[PDB]
Amino acid sequence: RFMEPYIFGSRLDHDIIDLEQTATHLQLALNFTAHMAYRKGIILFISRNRQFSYLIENMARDCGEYAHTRYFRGGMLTNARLLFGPTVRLPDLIIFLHT
RNA sequence: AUAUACCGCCAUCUUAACCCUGAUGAAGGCUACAAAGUACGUUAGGUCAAGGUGUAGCCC
Ligand SMILES: [Mg+2]
Questions:
Q1: Which nucleotide is nearest to A49 (CA to C1')?
Q2: What Å value separates CA A46 and C1' B46?
Q3: Distances (CA, A) of A4 to A10, A34, A77
Q4: Which string of DSSP letters, residue by residue, matches A13-54?
Q5: d(CA A78, CA A80)
Q6: A69 CA to middle of ligand 1, Å?
Q7: In whole angstroms, how large is the CA radius of gyration of chain A?
Q8: Interrupted after residues, chain A (C–N over 2.5 Å)
């Protein structure tokens, strides 16, 4: 339901995403990502689509950022201190290619 | 004579934290082609034959 305002219409029972809204949303998201990278924030890409795990890991390694395409264990973010150490720094921005 | 004196030795019997979910209820938390989970006494016991310490008996 919450995706309805972003849908241009249905073409033979297939939803079509309004690309005019996608352009503005992508502009805002890319501006935010660029500003965060300028401030040397830790950027973590996340995606459980196994068809693109290799590509996303390669991209994250290429841009000097971090990736998590594997099984997400309980408490990686909400219990990070116990799972990594008391002085671990969490990501400043998380990018979901697949939500 | 006494282990029905003790030991020695045999045998009997009794005997942590953290993180999520449920509207922050009792409560719950797993799937790998992965979906919240990680950190001693007891006995009128035997044995003084390969071991000891005492205790009492008798002494016309
Ligand atoms: Mg006896």
A1: B33
A2: 81
A3: 11, 28, 30
A4: TEEEE-HHHHHHHHHHHHHHHHHHHHTT--EEEE---GGGHH
A5: 6
A6: 80
A7: 17
A8: none
